[PDB]
């Protein structure tokens, strides 16, 4: 039910978003390596909000708070109106404490028939009417934040948006949404596809390198011909030949009306992710966020920020 994972992601881990990590650093880690300088009539925010477009993955973002942060532990859920009934987010409290240090978090945190069984329960022990919140944080995660009961957003005193990269976050997500795998692709084309626009999110460029990845098994499922060649039998890398059949275009330097039907598991010489490969997904795609989609946001800080 409730994720409870003591997490390892360094600052760097996290591609980017330093003007974030600044002000998350400012927010928590300050106040943590120096006690000595947060008491006497300013205290450490209990309760921050993390906001901004989808698919900007603030998820992870969390894990590294909680790691770049004494190693508390990560005590983690979500708003699926939790397990589509209650008792879980006493618990989740309970826990926080009993092995503090700790970090609530929820992604998904916007949420009639008032079912504030939760709803109130939540900010009852936000308010802690007893028991001690002290070295314990909570984090919300929402890609709209406009749709919260003033009550649930007045709590989070910090509130920090969370832009889209387009940077070379953007480009070195490439690389690892490539993860291990065959590619014609270089640092040069890397940092190419970074630059060749922006607007788009770890999401949708995860799901164009998601195209990207079959367009090889694409081609040869559907080849119109293959062409024979010379190396290693792709089953014994010592046993070289001259026979492996990749495929080729109608009228080529070698064609003949095959299909992998045809073409023997070993004598296949698989093509790889190539940059056009690359490029073509991507020229087939719109981001998933629109400057009218992220103006609906902009709402927020001008009749809100620190609610205040």
Partial sequence: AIVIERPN????????????????????????????????????????????????????????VATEANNSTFFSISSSDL?????????????ARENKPSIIFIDEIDSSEAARRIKTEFLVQMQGVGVDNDGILVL????????????????FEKRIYIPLPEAHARAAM???HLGSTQNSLTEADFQE?????????????????????????????????????????????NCIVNDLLTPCSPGDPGAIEMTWMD???????????????????LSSTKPTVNEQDLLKLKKFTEDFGQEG
Wanted: no cysteine.
């Fill in 9 to 64: 992601v360094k600052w760097s881990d996290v591609a980017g978003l330093e003007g974030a990590k600044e002000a998350l650093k400012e927010a928590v880690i300050l106040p943590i390596k120096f006690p000595h300088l947060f008491t006497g009539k300013r205290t450490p925010w209990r309760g921050i909000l993390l906001f901004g477009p989808p698919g900007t993955g603030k998820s992870y973002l969390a894990k590294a």
């Fill in 83 to 95: 397990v589509s009934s209650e008792k879980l987010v006493k618990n989740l409290f309970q826990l």
């Fill in 140 to 155: 919300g995660a929402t890609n709209i934040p406009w749709v919260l009961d003033s009550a649930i957003r007045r709590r």
């Fill in 174 to 176: 490439f690389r690892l």
């Fill in 193 to 237: 596809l970074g630059r060749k626009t922006d607007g788009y999110s770890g999401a949708d460029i995860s799901i164009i390198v998601r195209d990207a990845l079959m367009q090889p098994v694409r081609k040869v499922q559907s080849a119109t011909h293959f062409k024979k060649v010379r190396g290693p039998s792709r089953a014994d890398p």
């Fill in 263 to 281: 073409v023997p598991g070993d004598k296949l010489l698989e093509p790889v992710v190539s940059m056009w490969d690359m490029l073509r997904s």
